[PDB]
Each structure stands twice: as structure tokens, then as C-alpha cells.
Amino acid sequence: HQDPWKLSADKPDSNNYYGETVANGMIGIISSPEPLKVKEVVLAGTYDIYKRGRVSSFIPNYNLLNMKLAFNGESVQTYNINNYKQELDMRNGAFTGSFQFKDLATVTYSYYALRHLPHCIMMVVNINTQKDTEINVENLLETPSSLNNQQNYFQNITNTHVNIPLLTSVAFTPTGRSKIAVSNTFLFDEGKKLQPEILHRMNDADMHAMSFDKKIKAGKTYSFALIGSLISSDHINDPYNEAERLTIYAALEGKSRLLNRHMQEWNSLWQSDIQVEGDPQAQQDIRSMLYHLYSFTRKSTSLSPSPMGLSGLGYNGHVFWDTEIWMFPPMLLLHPEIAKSMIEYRYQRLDAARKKAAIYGYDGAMFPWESADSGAEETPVNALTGAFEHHVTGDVAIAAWQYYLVTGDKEWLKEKGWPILKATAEFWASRVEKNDKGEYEIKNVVAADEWAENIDNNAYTNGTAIRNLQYASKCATVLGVIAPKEWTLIADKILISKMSNGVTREHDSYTDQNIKQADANLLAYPLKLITDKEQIERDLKYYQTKIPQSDTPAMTQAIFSLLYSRLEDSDQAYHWFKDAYQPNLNPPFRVISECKGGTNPYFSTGAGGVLQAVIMGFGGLDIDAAGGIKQVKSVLPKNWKKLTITGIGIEKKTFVLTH
Amino acid sequence: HQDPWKLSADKPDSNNYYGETVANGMIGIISSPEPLKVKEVVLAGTYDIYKRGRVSSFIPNYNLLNMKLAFNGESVQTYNINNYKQELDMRNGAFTGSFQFKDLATVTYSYYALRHLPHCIMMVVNINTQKDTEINVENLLETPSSLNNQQNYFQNITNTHVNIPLLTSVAFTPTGRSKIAVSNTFLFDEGKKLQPEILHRMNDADMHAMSFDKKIKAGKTYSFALIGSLISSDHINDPYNEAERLTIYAALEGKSRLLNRHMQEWNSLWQSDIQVEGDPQAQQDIRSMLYHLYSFTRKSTSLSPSPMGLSGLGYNGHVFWDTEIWMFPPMLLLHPEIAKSMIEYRYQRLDAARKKAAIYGYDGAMFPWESADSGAEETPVNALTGAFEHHVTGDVAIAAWQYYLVTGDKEWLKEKGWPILKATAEFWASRVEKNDKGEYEIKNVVAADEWAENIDNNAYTNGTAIRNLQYASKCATVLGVIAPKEWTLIADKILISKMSNGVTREHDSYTDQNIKQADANLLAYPLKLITDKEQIERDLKYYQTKIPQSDTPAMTQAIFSLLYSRLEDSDQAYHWFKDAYQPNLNPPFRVISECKGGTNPYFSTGAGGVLQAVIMGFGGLDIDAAGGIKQVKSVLPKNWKKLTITGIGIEKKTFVLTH
């Protein structure tokens, strides 16, 4: 079960099963323990009011791959199959199930979120017979109860060469905000004259189905494919016609052409990779982390991942600083074009951040704690983070400047980076208060440690305000524009204090409290405002004791690891690397939950952090304040013989580390 | 667990649990294995397009009793309770849960579908603490995904004496057909000044809640009640205001007065009872059958039960001949006012039956195979029963005549029985075809044996046509109106055919096919067209093995039992009695599924059939063709020492049978 490219489960246990995701950055499909079913389908970019938090949310969508298979009229179930196995191939995001049905046939099915076609899915089914049998195949389009006002259609698209039967549904999100269309077809090898007749049934208010029978002689393989397109009014003006057009297109491209295009794009993604020798479990876990970030993002878009990517409705699908600080850095080093999409999401929401600033009495752009379609604040009103956790504005500024450092794209800096950096600097210039000693305070925030609410001079917050002001000033210099001199003046005098034990104080009310996650430690990495190794160690040793086992998210231990890696202490670095995710795992695919012993995977924020512990920590790779990637002192775990990191920076550099 | 009045379950197992129902004929509440939760709530008479069959359905409603209990901020869970038990008290339809929270406190909760207030529910909670403690109590109103366009309200109704806090939701069924309102309040003993402050939270799109804290002192019991009213636009023009009005009303009646009224109505129902000496399991099973029929019906209404009563969405809540032939006869003998409500359902739908007859090219009234709000046909179009299973019209006529035979109410016969009998007889007079030999045929039906589709001269159907025509003619005589003489001429010549072995032929294409359920055997009972004991026996011998073990509903073996009791064969009668329901049971409360090994309780139709086997079979009770209840020869099971049946007929007679 420790293949470096495949996650495997034998006889799925529905009582203890956390499904795995295949995704192309637009559609996520989460596995069911039941054969030929999917648990959940999520479409990126589609939000409406729905359940949790009374704010916009991802919407459970059509389980468009749901299939029923019968042999000689006998329905295939978990209870009458044997040797049932599930496997995720991380090389191409293929989810495959395989089983034996009695004395009749072996069934293999593989499904894909097609990497090149953001709105298209494909499942390929192979039936290998040991006896003469007849299969009945049904594909069901059940309207989930999240949607309303559904319509169920079926038609034949024909010419002299083809009969493409389309099973289509159209429905609406709860408030009618978004119209969803789904269109499915079956692909056969045998041709129009010999292919099975497709029947259509509409027996339920919320379900219709297309079906066929096929006689298969003993000793033969019969193959068919299901193609489906899933799109909304958030993506295209006319989703109904566009879904049918896309499925017709995909059918006439065919299975072979679609899988070739899919493989080419996944091959490109894996040109940036992490190879560990001497630790097969680490090798597989790190692949799973890269796989999830690659699956949950998409180059050449304005999409940004939620903390759970496309693994479900975690945090309503909203975008947090979890992108800028946690998932963005590893993607910027491995595939800058993914980082570009993540910052594009924020650039296209600059107007909404300017609006939020105005409503709360500030200047410039105030990015929301939680973001969705418009870029307006989406934090549930019962959570104080929405009105009061303000470091997110600096987090967006930091990512924008890092994007420029790593790419050196000055045209991007002029058109997108500077608009972000200038407006966010203007926010911080209006957000600080000067005190009687000429220092600048930031008062009444929620800290990065979110347990500390409506407090003053949060360390991490003050750090991001400093970097935002400094990077806006450096940006102005790169573009030959005059920055307000107040930005540098404010940045130099923003308060960061030590307690009487020589430890950086989290906020003005802090002494010895338990903390939710890393805050003061983030001034060392990623902000690098603290470079003194003795102050890093003091802050490490103190705060690493303050994180409780329970209800603490995976936004902490990965940083402890990276910093101990920077201080060249293997045992500590490796201890914190494991603690960062191993206690958060769910069976049978080792998906990551938000918290230790949690049951809400997949927390791609957590994977982002650990990838930084590996690349910036063990690999010693670092964004150089002067541009591009450099390498500082690092160590490897005792048990790792070699760490290889490929496709780094715009030079696509390979880094090899050994003891 | 064989108390003759109580069904009990220790430590509910959620992996193998079928909830029990409390109901008042208007609201049904189905139990959850989880403490202080309910699984499903169903409101009678509310139908809309929803899921199965693309036709009207009962709708899952607000789980209005859902509660969260915490001790000093620690929420009650599986892992922190012990001695957790559930009990259904069949004497008063009280569902009780009880558990110990750690070693700190004992909690009991009993809930009720108030028997006198059709739209009102109450849960009473008692907490006894061994140490000083603080409880937090939350009542949640979660809008189920079956409903839409919800609104979540909270207000205080006050005067100098009271503060009644109302938690209200209003929402719509899927097509907007019906507006639902629910309104809940807490009742306290301690009075306005000392009662806990009620907080309201609206944190989700589909859920709001009211909550309080209360300090309880060591060795003290703290009691509180939750009252809820649930009503729709199908029941009242303004359900929003009526729900709040009802809850205010119930709050100012108070727990005592409400439970006293509830008890009085339940005591009256149990004045008709069946007592078995020598077989505690039979005694409990038979009490459960009476309990479910009493819970799923209501005197002084026009309500009729679905095959699953108010236990859930079984058969979309539709009314079938399952009422007239299966649930109606035992209720007519025990509580004629329940039978009166069942036939009133049909009387008020006679217009809709005249419309169906006209649409299908017939005279008079053609009752639908499946009925709901309007009385129009509601059968899913994919089931040929809707268009072709015509015996339901005769079944309605038979119940209407039986109502008059048992009550002797000639004013009812004039106003309601005759309109039904005349219109249904006009239907059959138009439905038959005279052949060459002067016989009358009924061609192209679905049989009572529903596996036989589009066949001619079905035994049961033809028998119901004969009885309908005879009973309509008899009714005309009683009331002094002139009946068409064609009705008797047709009745005497409708074909009922024998095979070469002298066995009644199920239909013109019938030889030895397996059959879904009793059909030819129904000519012996209930129709009594076959009275010759040798004919009854040869029909039993031929058909009794024609019903497969699998996928055959509980509409057969109870009739076999009854006929063997009439033949004075105790071993066969008791064999078929047990076979009728014991192989259909679900744990932990021995609820009844439709089929053997089935998982869709509670099939009230099956209970109605078995009650006929007990009352008409073992008790020998019979509707005399001349009027009233008579007693014919019967046998008891070997192991039954005494059978006592109380409250029979309008004279409320007690029958005692011994060996």
C-alpha cells in the first residue's frame, strides 16, 4: 500500500471511509466506497447561500458518474462482488475500482477530471467475461437537494456516422443565483449500426437515466465510456447549450484523444516533483500533497483554492490567507503559472477590497478575511474574524511581491502587482495609530492566533503591515514612481515587543495563554523580520509548548519543522514534519484533516505548509529579497538518504541534497 | 422486552435501527437512535412533487423536537452517556429515552403527538443531578432540504404573567404548492421572573435555534417542556399565524392539561383491545398492530392512511385499496368512527372519481389506483396499475356497503353510501363487455396479483364488480330508490372461470405462474363469493405455494391464516399467521416491512391484514350480509389459552374464545 505514485484501498469499509478526490482545478469528484458511484461533485467558482454560516458556499452538484450495472438482471452491489479494490494513480489523477462479479466477469472502471477540459469528466468501464453474460448499464442524473427547478432532457445528436445520445439536466442553486447544466453521453467502440440502443427513463421528480443492454460472450472484453460536462452561469452565459456542445465535442474527440491530452497536461505538472530516497511513506505522502495542490489549482485562470480545494464544501469553498501564505509559496517555486492564477483571483477582486476599506473607514484596499465570487467579505457574521482579522491584506501584498521576485515579470508588476501593493499600503497607512513615543500601533484585531480576539498590536499582523509597506515602497522604486515617504516612516516604527523572558509577545494582552496556531514564529518564516537564530530558537521553544493537541489547525508544526531545518537540527525538524500531518490523517488514502484526529479532509492548507517544510526547510530553498530562488543551510531527516526537487524557479532548476 | 404495553430497546445500535413512530393521525414522528433527536416528521394531507414516482408525495418536515443538551459546556454524546434506553408506551404513544450523563446526572425525555391537538407535539425533559451543575439546552429548527424559501423568526409573547418565547420557521414544499409553518416554545414551572432567558441564534441559512442555561442544585430534578405546532396551507389559509396561535394556546393550557386530554383520548382508543393469554410475544405484536392503526388514523375527519401511515414517505403517502380491504375492516369492527373517516376520504373525492371515469371513457365514478389531496389519479406513470388496476372502484363500494352493514346508519347511506355505490355501479355497468354467450367480461386489467398485467377476467377484479353491482342494488332497495335492473343482470353473468382441476382461474391467461399476492383466494375472504369449503380448500392448495418468498408484500398470508381458521385448521392457521409478519420484522421494535427481509417499515397494510386474521379468523367475527357482526366457527393457535376481543360493533361486545 506504499507505491510512490498510487494510493490503494482493499475492500472499502463504508463505516470508516474518507473518499479521495480527482480534480482539474475546476471540477472535483470525491470517491464513494460503493462501486461505480461518486460521493460528491464540486464545481469551482459557483457560490450561493447554502447551509453553513448563512453566507455564500460551494454547492453539492450532480453526481454525474453514478452508474448501475446488472449482470443477467442481477444488480451489482458491495455485498455480491469480491476482490473489490480502489486505487488513485497520482501520475494522471485516475481513480480506478476493480472487482469480480461471481463466475461472470471482472469489472474495471477508471474516472478522470479531464486536465485539458476544465468542465469535462470521463469514466472508462472494462468488462472481462469468464462466462456468457448480458449487462444492463444505467447512468443516473439525480438532481441533488441543494438544487431546485430542475429539468431532465434526453436527445439524439446524429449524422451519417454517429448517434450521440445526450442525457442532460439543468437546475438552479438555492436562491436562483446560478444555473447549472450537466450533459452526459456513452462512447462505444463498435460504431453507430452495432452500438446498443439507448433508452431514457424519467420516473422520478429528481432523477432520470439512460440505459442499455449488451450481450457479451465468454472470454471477451467489452469497453464503454461515460463522458459528462458540468458548467454553470458563473462560467458561461448559456450553460445548457454549452454543456451539450462540450459533450458532443468530447464524444467526437473520443476516449483515446481525450486521455492523450489529459496525460500530456499531467506529464507537464509532474516535471516539478519531489523525490525522497530511503523513506517510502514520506515519498508517497509528499506525492499526495503535490498531487492535491496540482489537482486543486489551475494555470491561466483567476481561480484560488479554498482550504479544502475541491475535496468538498470545507469552509464554504471560500478563499483565505491559506492561499497567499500556505498553498501559494510551494506552487510559486514549482509552477509560477499556478501562483499567477492565485494572485489573479485577488487582482480581479481589488474593487471589492477598496469597497470593504471604505465601509470600515479605511483608505486603499482591505481584502476580506473570507472571499468568494465578488471579493466582498464572506465570513459568517457569528465569527469576529470577518470584521477584525486584518493581516489578510498584508498576506495578499506579500504574495503579490513574491510573485514579482520569483518571475521578475516587470510588466505584471506594473499592471497587477503595483495596483495591489499601492492600495494595500494605503490601507495600512490609514490603519495604524501614532502614539506619544512616535511608534505606530495597530489596535483592536483578531490575531493569527484566532483565540486572541479584539486585542492590540498582534505580532504577525504588525509584521505583515511592515512587509506590505516595505514591498509597496520597493515596488514604487522598481517602476520609477514616487511612494508616500510615510510608508517607510510607518514601517520602521510599527511596534513588535518582547516579554521579560526575551520572547516575542503575540499581542498587548498576552503573557502565557495557549495559542490556536503559529503567530509570532511567522516573523522568522515566512516574513524573515527575525533572522537572529537565538531569537528564532527562543520564540520556537516557548510557543511550541502553547499549541494544544485538540482543535488546532495544520498551520503551525510545518513552520516549526522549516525553522529547525534552517537551524540545522534534523531530529527536531523531522519530529515537527511528522506531527504536522500524520496525526490528522483519515483512512484509507491518508487524506489530511484540518486538526489532529479531525474528520473534515482534505485540508490542502495543511499540505501547502508541509510542502514548504520540505522545499524551503529540508531543501533550504528561499525567495531571495533581491529576486529569484537561492538556497540557505538545511539538514535532512536521519532516515532520508536523498532529497531531489525538480522544476524550481523560472530557470526550472533541479536541487539534490544528501547527508 | 415482551411487556404487553411497551416496546423497549437497550443501547440503540445506529448500524441496525429502524425507528418507531408516535402519531395522532395528523403528525408522525419517527425515532432516532441518537438521544434528544428525531429522524423524520411527516404531516398528513400535505403533498407536493418530490423524489419517487414524479407524482405528489408526503414531504419530510421539520425535525422540530431536535435538542442539544450540555453539562458545564460538555455536549451529550454517545461516548459520555451510559444505561441509554428507549421505550414506546403503546398505552399513550409516549416515546421515552433515558440515560446517565457520566456519573453526574440522569436525563429522561418523553415526546407525544398530542392526541386531541392534531397539529401539536410536546417533549417533556427531566434532569436529576447528583452535584450542583449548569445545563445548556438548545432547540434547533433545521429546514429540511425537502423545503425551500425558508424564513427563521423569533419573538416574545408577553403579558404581566407570561413570557412565551416563540421559535418559528415558515417554508415551502418543492413546487411552492404548500406553505409550512412550525412554532416552538419552552414551558417552565418556575414562572416568568425566575425562568431562564431565551437566546436566539440564526447562524446558518437552513437552521436557527433557541437556547438557555440553568443552574440545577445537587439532588434536585429540573423539568422543562418543548411544545411545537406544525401546520400547512393544506390545513389552514394562514399557517404562519395559526402555528404561533396554537403554540401560545398550548403553552397557556400547560403540560398537565395537555397530557390529561392526550391520555383521555388514548384511553378511549384502547376500550377496543385484543388480549391473548399464553403467548406474550403474540400479545405484544398484536398490541403493536392496533397501536399503529390507532396512531395512523383519526376519527371525525376525512383522513385515510397510506400503506405506511405516518411512519415515513412509503408509497408517497398515497391512499390505496390498502385502506378499504386491509386497514378498514379491523377498524370498522373496533372503532366504526375510524372507518367513517376512511370512507369520508372517498366520499369527498367522488367528483375526482367521476372526472377520472370520464377521462378513461367510462360512466359513474372510477376511483384512482392511488389517491392523495384531490382524489385524481396519482400513480407513477411507469406503473401500469394506475391506468389498468380497476378493482379499487369495487373495493371502495365494498367498504361503503360494509360501513352501513356494521352501523345501520341509514342517514349516512342516503347522504354518502348511496352516492358512492350508485356512481361505482354505473362505472362497472359501463366497464363490462357482453360476449356471444351473454356473459359479461372485464378485459385488459392489471390483476390484484400485480405481476399479471393487461390480462382478461381477473378473478378478484370480476368479484369486486359483482359485489359492487349487488351492493348498489341492495342499497337502492333499502332507500326506496329504483336501481337499473341491468346491475343485477350483469352481476349474475360476470365470468369467474375454473381450470380443469376445479381451481378458480386467476385470469384468462393463467395456468401456474407465480403470483405477487392473494387474488383468487380473496373470492373466499373477503368477498365470500366462494363459501363451499371444498372449493376454498382446493383454491388454497393450488395457490398457497404460488407466492415467492422474495419481493412479495404482506397482503397474502393473513388471508391464508383467516381461511384456515374458518376451515378449523389450527396448525395451518397459526403457521400462516406467523408467516404473515414475523419474517418482515425490523429491530429493535419489531416494526413491519412490506416484504420478507424488507427494510421499509412501517407497512400498516400488513398490520391491517394480520388484525383480520386475529379478529375475523381466530375470533370468527364476520360482517353479516344482513347487517351487524356475527361469529362463525374458528380455532385458536394450540399455545393460545384465551383470546379476548373488546369493543366490537355498535353494541361494543366482548368476545372470549378458548380451546
From Swiss-Prot, chains A, B:
What family, per the record? Belongs to the glycosyl hydrolase 65 family.
Mention any one GO cellular component term assigned to this protein in its UniProt record: periplasmic space
Active site residues of this protein: 450 (proton donor), 594 (proton acceptor)
Protein name per the record:
Kojibiose hydrolase
Thermoactivity: Optimum temperature is 40 degrees Celsius.
Q: Would I find rRNA-binding among this entry's keywords? A: no
Q: Where in the cell is it found?
A: Periplasm
Positions in coiled-coil regions: none
For this UniProt record, give its keywords in alphabetical order, as a comma-separated list. Answer: Carbohydrate metabolism, Glycosidase, Hydrolase, Periplasm, Signal
Molecular function (GO) terms for this protein are:
carbohydrate binding; glycosyltransferase activity; hydrolase activity, hydrolyzing O-glycosyl compounds
* Alphabetized InterPro entries for the sequence: 6-hairpin_glycosidase_sf, 6hp_glycosidase-like_sf, Gal_mutarotase_sf_dom, Glyco_hydro_65_M, Glyco_hydro_65_N, Glyco_hydro_65_N_sf
Broad EC category: hydrolase
Q: Which GO terms describe its biological process?
A: carbohydrate metabolic process
State the oligomer form and interacting partners.
Answer: Homohexamer; dimer of trimers.
According to its UniProt record, the EC number is 3.2.1.216
Reaction equation(s) it catalyzes: kojibiose + H2O = beta-D-glucose + D-glucose
Q: Which Gene3D superfamilies match?
A: 1.50.10.10, Glycoside hydrolase, family 65, N-terminal domain
Residues that bind beta-D-glucose 3, according to the entry? 451, 516, 551
Q: What does this protein do?
A: Glycosidase that specifically hydrolyzes kojibiose to beta-glucose and glucose. Also hydrolyzes, with lower catalytic efficiency, longer kojioligosaccharides (from kojitriose to kojipentaose) and shorter oligosaccharides produced by the degradation of dextran-containing alpha-1,2 branches. Probably acts on alpha-(1->2)-glucosyl isomaltooligosaccharides. Shows weak activity with nigerose but has no activity toward p-nitrophenyl alpha-glucopyranoside, which is a general substrate of exo-acting alpha-glucoside hydrolases. Has a strict specificity for alpha-1,2-glucosidic linkages.
The residues listed in the UniProt record as binding beta-D-glucose 1, with positions renumbered to this chain, are 52, 369-370, 385, 450, 516
Positions binding beta-D-glucose 2 in this chain are: 321-322, 516-517
Q: How does activity depend on pH?
A: Optimum pH is 5.5.
Q: Does the keyword Signal apply?
A: yes
Segments passing through the bilayer = none
